[PDB]
Amino acid sequence: ANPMREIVVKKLCINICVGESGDRLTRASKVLEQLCEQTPVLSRARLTVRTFGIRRNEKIAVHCTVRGKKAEELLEKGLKVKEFELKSYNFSDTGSFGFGIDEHIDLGIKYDPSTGIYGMDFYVVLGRRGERVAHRKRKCSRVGHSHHVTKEEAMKWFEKVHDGIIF
Amino acid sequence: AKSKNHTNHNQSSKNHRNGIKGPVPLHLHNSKRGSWLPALVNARRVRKHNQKAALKKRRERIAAFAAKN
Amino acid sequence: KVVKNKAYFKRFQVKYRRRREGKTDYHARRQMVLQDKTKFGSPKYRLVVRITNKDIIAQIVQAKIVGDEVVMAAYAHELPAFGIEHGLTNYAAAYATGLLLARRTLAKLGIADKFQGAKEADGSYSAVRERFPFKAILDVGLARTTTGARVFGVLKGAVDGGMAVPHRPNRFPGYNKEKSSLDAKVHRDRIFGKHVAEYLKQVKCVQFSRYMAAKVLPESIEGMYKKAHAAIRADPSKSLPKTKKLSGAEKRAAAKAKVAAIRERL
Amino acid sequence: VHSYGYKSGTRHLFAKKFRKHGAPSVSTILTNIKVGDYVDVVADSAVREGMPHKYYHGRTGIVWNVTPRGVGVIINKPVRTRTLRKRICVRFEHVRKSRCQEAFKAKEHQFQAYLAAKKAGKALPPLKKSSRMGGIVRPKNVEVLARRVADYEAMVPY
RNA sequence: GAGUACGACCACACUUGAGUGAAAACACCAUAUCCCGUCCGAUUUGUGAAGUUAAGCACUCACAGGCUCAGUUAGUACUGAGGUCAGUGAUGACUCGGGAACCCUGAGUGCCGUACUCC
RNA sequence: GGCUGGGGCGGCAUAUCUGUUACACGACAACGCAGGUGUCCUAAGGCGAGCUCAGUGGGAACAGAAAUCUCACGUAGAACACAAGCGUAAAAGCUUGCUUGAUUAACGAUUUCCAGUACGAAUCGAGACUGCGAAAGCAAGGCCAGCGAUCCUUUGCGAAGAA
RNA sequence: AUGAUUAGAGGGACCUAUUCUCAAACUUUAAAUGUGCAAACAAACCGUGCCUUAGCCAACUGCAAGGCCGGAAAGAAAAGAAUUAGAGGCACCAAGUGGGCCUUCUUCGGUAAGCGGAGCAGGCGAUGCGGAAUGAACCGC
């Protein structure tokens, strides 16, 4: 009994954290548009720190969300960086992934003697097709336990296509 | 001298010595000046026409009496 | 750690069933149902438009304590009787429903031919109100009231049917908002389905599979609804032809058997 | 009460009961109030504007003015030697039609329905008699009252 | 016997883990020219109907948590009236009367309207 | 000046607001207890829409207890200018949009304190012109402490035109 | 739940279920005594009654109001199913007082007080008389 419940990749969320606002943030905001082809929304700061060197509402990070065909081909383009090998330490209990990607140059975009080289953060959300039930405004209710994606089932899903893992 | 004393002591004995007079009946004071006005207007616009009709009955009972005898 | 602690359910207060089910917006209808207390029991109706994908529902509902009561109810799925065989959920049908509801209630209440409303549906905005027309509020529900939304299509389906529903031509499709004026043209095109009639011609397996298979020409559409409009106005009332529980002993008996079963193994 | 404010004495009178919290229900919006009708003034705490004063909570009177969102009520407030008859202005969320007058107006109906029932008989239901009048008792079981030796060790627990 | 739309009382309705769901519905769903809205057609908005009961929803289940009602706790605690009552006191019993609460046990696990529809 | 466990010194119990004393309506004293007030806000007022908060747990380049992204849980454990209480979860909180109902309001009534006087604050209205909203509706400030007689000074309304 | 708080156990801290002990400024629950109203004569109840409206509404002879005209009226049965030295109501003018004190019960500050401060009542003050040998207030009256 598995008609609709095959796993798919719902969203790939990119995150770039920068402990400062200004140029390097405005630059990285351009590093995403070149890459994920969407104008990003930039985070602000939730609180002051004084060690990290961040105050509140400083515009720390610039992140973007990616869905659909852009997301698979960009997943591949970023999953090839680490050579389709990653650590099972990196699988959420909800069935999601993460990648270091210290160099966005490794992601295929030509360098500009302005921006420089940034660290990227890819994070993937795997879910079955029935999960609108938890979002839609009217008659919103829980997804149900049987239908959630397990930490294991997301491992196999990753070992079905572009295999391999380490513990 | 400490002059700041406060007591309720003898009071409800005085308040009941002429008794606590019960309320005034509903019919006695109505005097609706509060009041929700567009209903108050439409009440006097009738209360005039009840005067004509009732003061007319005063005349029809003058004739009908002298008519009888 | 565990926040579902035994004492959590103990002090937990439940929201209303229609709130748990996510069906009704209670801060809303509580404001819609209310009325001046000087109007004592004076009947106050509201037309509720609830669009369930594959269908549309437009009802006229008096609200009272024992429960709401429905004067008349129109459905998108009753349109095929009137000649609309495809796309029952679109804006064009959303207009017909509520033109069906408006004309079916005015026959219901006996008003009948006294109030008619524009037959050309050369859609335009007019102020709502010698006799004053039948008045009903529009009840959106949880829909977002974005301009163009179908819920407000039913709105001018009723208005064009003679019911007086207070509104402003703000959320109808074809409205600038850069200039305060509504463009009746773009709004008409949306009414008779030109937005659909243009998007078939742009297609010609899955999308519009029933349109193509049933062979509707994109040119026939603005005439298909137009006949259905004048058909609704003629005949309003035409529609589509034609585990047992365990008892208190069984729950307990099955339990003492289940324990003695595993109490005999050790 | 230290400060003698407007709503100075109440963290309880104005608090909602446990797990009864919420905004006022529909059924109290769809009640309608006619002038002359008796009413309970019980302040709901989930509506800020329109509350009656701390004294009037829990009283009953005759509504007199009725305004679109308001009512008004005539309540008896005893003062030094006399009862003033007070007129207060409340938002009707705080108002509930009283059942006080009820059993009486039901005694009046069950008289008239009684009377039209005798008019041409059909007879009438029988008149219930006293329970205090006489009788022989036929006991099915009889027991002894005594103070038991055992009754004392039950009263010293432990 | 059910579904949907609106609802009244707002846990006997909730919460968790399982199981089963006739038809019609509901929904998931496919899609993004047009109206419209976002970083993302995710939410949303517009078009439609290829697929699935997997999930929501309905139902059943659990010596389940909670909640409802009744027992018990107990005529105990407390308390209105009384004494030229006991006691050094602290307090207590008594006399004419009202009279609780949790734990604990058993039993229940929604109900009631308007409108349209399915066998 | 006054109150004052003699007066003085100190204090403020002098006008005042929340909890408690306070005895399950209301009322109730002390130099009784624990704290507040003389301000602050064109947004922190008005409204519509969308959203959910404190925190916890899994996971993500640097990145750690603590940055940002993501998912799940989350009966309010947050927030609402401030003392305290009360109330609020598709909001009364948060974000955002448009705004000036923080104006005028014919001498309306009523509550609170109470002599049923005034002041302060508040509730219910009717009229004008409005705001936001598709609409029902909401708003005459930020609920409830944040304040002022006679006399005197001072400003505003009683434009022009017509009879 | 919020705030205090002792101990062992189960899976150094933690987590889970218990455990000893508490709250004027805590509370799910929640009395006794209380408190608001109602209990038939300017009222209420009944009617395919009628008149009037610049009130409500998509109705319209529905609902609001002031009436009018008819109806009935154990004048409030039965069920424990009230009682009364129950004439109700309004007004004018004016004195004295505005230092109180004692007590059952509740009660706050104080180690306590024939101390200071309140609540519901009863007394002395203003009042003797009989009784507790004597005592303002106790007991009887």
The pair of structure tokens assigned to A84 is: 């389709």
Q: Which residues contact C231 (CB under 8 A, 6 or more apart)?
A: C82, C83
D89 interaction partners in chain C (CB closer than 8 Å): none
Rounded Cα distance, A141 and A158, in Å: 29
State how far the Cα of D90 lies from the Cα of C155, in Å rounded to an integer.
Answer: 37
DSSP helix/strand/coil, A123: strand
CB contact under 8 A, D30 and C33: yes
Residue that has been written with the tokens 């959420």 in this structure: A92
Determine the nucleotide nearest to D35 by Cα–C1' distance: G64
CA dist., res. C30 & res. C44, Å (int): 13
C20–chain A nearest CA distance, Å: 8
Tokens of C194: 């030109």
Q: Tokens in use for B48? A: 């005039």
* Contact call for A141 and C23, based on CB within 8 A: no
Structure token pair of residue A74: 């960009």
The contacts of residue A30 (CB under 8 Å, 6+ apart) are A115
Helix (H) or strand (E) holding A64: strand A62-67
Phi, psi of A41 (to 5 degrees): -95, 135
**Positions of strand F less than 7 angstroms from a protein CB:** 3-7, 14, 16-22, 25-36, 49-51, 55-76, 85-92, 106, 108-113, 115-116, 120-127, 133-139, 143-145
Beta bridge partners of A97: A124
Cα-based angle C110, C114, C120 (whole degrees, multiple of 5): 120
- Are A62 and A32 contacting, i.e. CB atoms less than 8 angstroms apart? yes
Residues 152-211 of C with CB under 7 A from strand E: 173-175, 186, 190, 195-196, 198-199, 202, 206-211
Q: How far apart (Å, rounded) are the C-alpha atoms in residues A67 and A13?
A: 8
Residue B13 CA to nucleotide E80 C1', Å? 21
C-alpha distances (whole Å) from C138 to each of C1, C9, D81 are 48, 39, 57
- A16 phi/psi in degrees, rounded to 5: -120, 110
Q: Is the C-beta of residue D58 closer than 7 Å to nucleic acid chain G?
A: yes
Q: How far apart are CA D158 and CA D154, in angstroms?
A: 9
3-state DSSP call for residue D71? strand
- Whether chain A has a CB inside 8 Å of the CB on C21: the answer is yes
Q: Nearest chain C residue to D27 by CA: give it.
A: C65
Q: How far is CA D152 from CA C44, D148, D155, D156, in A?
A: 71, 7, 5, 7
Give the integer Cα–Cα distance in Å for D102 and D104: 5
Point out the residue among D18, D23, D33 whose CB comes nearest to the CB of C37. D33
Q: Which residue of B has its CA nearest to D63?
A: B26
User: How many Å apart are C38 CA and E35 C1'?
Assistant: 42
Torsion angle (degrees, nearest 10) of CA C126, C127, C131, C132: 120
Both tokens of residue C175? Answer: 């409205």
Of C60, C63, C64, C62, nearest to C72 by C-alpha is: C60
Please report, rounded to whole angstroms, the spatial distance between the CA atom of protein residue C78 and the C1' atom of nucleotide E48.
Answer: 18
Query: Could you tell me the two tokens for A158?
Result: 């990753």
Closest nucleotide (CA of C48 to C1')?
E6
What amino acid occupies position C266? Answer: L
Calpha distance C46→C136 (Å, rounded): 5
Cα(D92)–Cα(D52) distance, integer angstroms: 10
In sequence order, what E strands does chain C have?
A: 45-50, 57-64, 67-75, 136-139
- Neighboring chain B residues of D78 at a CB cutoff of 8 Å: 20
Q: Which two tokens stand for residue D13?
A: 């009178």
- Please give the structure tokens belonging to residue C209: 């599979």
Which residues 24-43 of chain C have a CB within 8 Å of chain B?
38
Q: Residue C28 CA to nucleotide F32 C1', Å?
A: 50
H-helix or E-strand spanning residue A98: strand A96-99
Nearest to B36 among D67, D74, D82 (CB): D67
Question: Which residues, 6 or more positions from C91, have their beta carbon under 8 angstroms from its beta carbon?
Answer: C148, C150, C153, C173, C190, C191, C193, C195
Q: Residue D153 corresponds to which tokens in the numbers above?
A: 């060790």
Cα C254 off chain centre by: 48
Which candidate from C22, C141, C144 shows the least CB-CB separation from A140? C22
Rounded distance between C-alpha atoms, residue A154 and residue B5, angstroms:
81
Report the residue of chain D nearest B38, measured CA to CA.
Answer: D67
* Cα–Cα distance measured from residue B60 to residue D24, given in angstroms and rounded to the nearest whole number: 56
For C99, list phi and psi in degrees, rounded to 5: -85, -30
- In the structure encoding, which two tokens stand for residue C214, read together? 């049933």
Q: What is the dihedral of CA A14, A17, A20, A26, to 10 degrees?
A: -20
Residue of D nearest to C44 (CA): D30
Q: CB-based contacts of D131: which residues, under 8 Å, 6+ apart?
A: none
The dihedral built from the CA positions of residue A55, A57, A63 and A65, taken in this order, carries a sign that is positive
| CB contact A137 to C (< 8 Å) | yes
How far apart are the C-alpha atoms of C55 and D51, rounded to whole Å?
A: 46
Strand arrangement of the beta sheet that strand D71-78 belongs to: D83-90, D71-78, D59-66, D38-41, D95-97
Location of structure tokens 């270091």? A100
Round to the nearest angstrom and report the end-to-end CA distance of chain C.
Answer: 35
Between strands D71-78 and D83-90, the pairing is: antiparallel
In terms of DSSP H, where are the helices of chain A?
23-36, 68-79, 151-160
C19 touches chain A (CB under 8 A): no
Q: Where are the alpha helices (DSSP H) in C88-215?
A: 91-96, 99-108, 151-159, 184-192, 194-201, 209-213
Beta bridge partners of C182: C175
**Cis ω before C26 (30° cut-off from 0):** no
Residue among B15, B32, B34 whose CB faces D80 most closely:
B15
Return the residue matching tokens 């005798």: D118
Number of CB atoms found within 10 A of residue C178's CB? 6
Q: CA C69, CA D72: separation in Å to the nearest integer?
A: 31
Phi, psi of A144 (to 5 degrees): 100, 145
CA/C1' separation D2–F149 (Å)? 28
Contact list, B23 vs chain D (CB under 8 Å): 76, 83, 85
Contacts of D53 (CB under 8 A, 6+ apart): D6, D88
Quote the strand ranges of D24-155, DSSP E: 38-41, 59-66, 71-78, 83-90, 95-97
Q: What is the largest CA-CA distance in chain A?
A: 55
Distance CA D59, CA C154 (A): 48
| Token digits of residue A142 | 């829980």
Token reading at A6: 């095959």
Q: List all residues of chain B from 10 to 69 with a beta carbon under 8 Å from chain C.
A: 36, 38-39
Measured in whole angstroms, the distance separating CA B20 from the mean position of its chain's CA atoms is 21
Tokens matching residue A29 = 């905001």
In the 3-class helix/strand/coil scheme, how is chain A assigned residue by residue?
CCCCCCCEEEEEEEEECCCCCCHHHHHHHHHHHHHHCCCCEECCCCCCCCCCCCCCCCCCCEEEEEEHHHHHHHHHHHHCCCCCCCEHHHCCCCCEEEECCCCCHHHCCCCCCCCCCCCCEEEEEEECCCHHHHCCCCCCCCCCCCCCCCHHHHHHHHHHCCCCCEC
Q: For residue C42, how many C-alpha atoms fall within 13 Å in the half-sphere facing its CB? A: 10
Helix (H, G, I), strand (E, B) or coil at C146: coil
Residue C22 Cα, gap to closest chain A Cα (Å) = 4
Signed CA dihedral, C230, C233, C234, C238: sign only: positive
In 10 A of CB C119, how many CB atoms?
Answer: 10
Closest CB to C38: pick one of D22, D29, D67: D67
User: What distance in Å separates the CA atoms of residue D70 and residue D95, rounded to the nearest whole number?
Assistant: 10
Question: How do A96-99 and A121-127 pair as beta strands?
Answer: antiparallel
Q: For chain A, say whether C52 makes contact (Cβ under 8 Å).
A: no
Query: Which positions in chain D touch C66 (Cβ < 8 Å)?
Result: none
Are C88 and C78 contacting, i.e. CB atoms less than 8 angstroms apart?
Answer: no
DSSP label of D26: G
- Note the residue count of chain A: 167
Return phi, psi of residue D85, to 5°: -115, 105
Q: List the resolution, Å.
A: 2.9
Q: For residue C38, list chain B residues with Cβ-Cβ distance below 8 A.
A: 36, 38-39
Q: Residues C76, C239: contact at Cβ < 8 Å?
A: no
Question: CA A86 to CA A103: how far, in whole Å?
Answer: 17
Distances (CA, A) of C177 to C181, C231, D158: 7, 35, 82
Looking at residue C32, its amino acid is M
Rounded distance between C-alpha atoms, residue D98 and residue A107, angstroms: 76
Question: Partners for B (CB, 8 Å, 3+ pairs)?
Answer: C, D
A12 forms bridges with which residues in the sheet?
A: A66, A124
Pairwise CA distance, residues B1 & B7, whole Å: 17
Q: Strand, coil or helix: what is D82?
A: strand
Dihedral, CA atoms, C14, C18, C19, C22, nearest 10 degrees? Answer: 140
Whole-number Cα distances in Å, C239 to B32, C75, C80, C113: 56, 10, 8, 21
Whether the Cβ atoms of residue C129 and residue C92 lie closer than 8 Å to each other = no
CB A95 within 8 A of CB A126: yes
* CB distance A120 to A81 below 8 Å: no
Neighbours of A102 (CB within 10 A): 12
Q: How far is B58 from chain D (nearest CA, A)?
A: 31
**CB contact at 8 A, B5 and D71:** no
Residue D90: how many other CB atoms lie within 10 Å: 20
**Count of other CB atoms within 10 angstroms of residue A104:** 24
Q: Look up residue A25 and give its two tokens.
A: 């943030």
- The single residue listed with the structure tokens 């959106």 is C140
For residue A23, what are its two tokens? 């140029």
Name the token pair of B28: 């006695």
Q: Find and list the nucleotides of strand E having atoms within 7 Å of a protein beta carbon.
A: 4-11, 13-20, 25-31, 33-40, 42-63, 65-67, 107-110, 112-118
Nucleotide nearest to A66 (CA to C1'): E40
Q: Which of D55, D59, D84, D78 is nearest to B15 (CA)?
A: D78
Exposed, middle or buried by CB within 10 Å (0-12, 13-18, 19+), for D92?
buried
Number of CB pairs, chain C paired with chain D, less than 8 A apart? 41
D90 and D100 Cβ atoms separated by less than 8 Å: no
Return the percent helix, strand and coil in chain B, to nearest 5.
55, 0, 45
Solving technique: cryo-EM
Cα dihedral: B11, B16, B19, B21 (round 10): 50
Q: Is D84 helix (H, G, I), strand (E, B) or coil?
A: strand
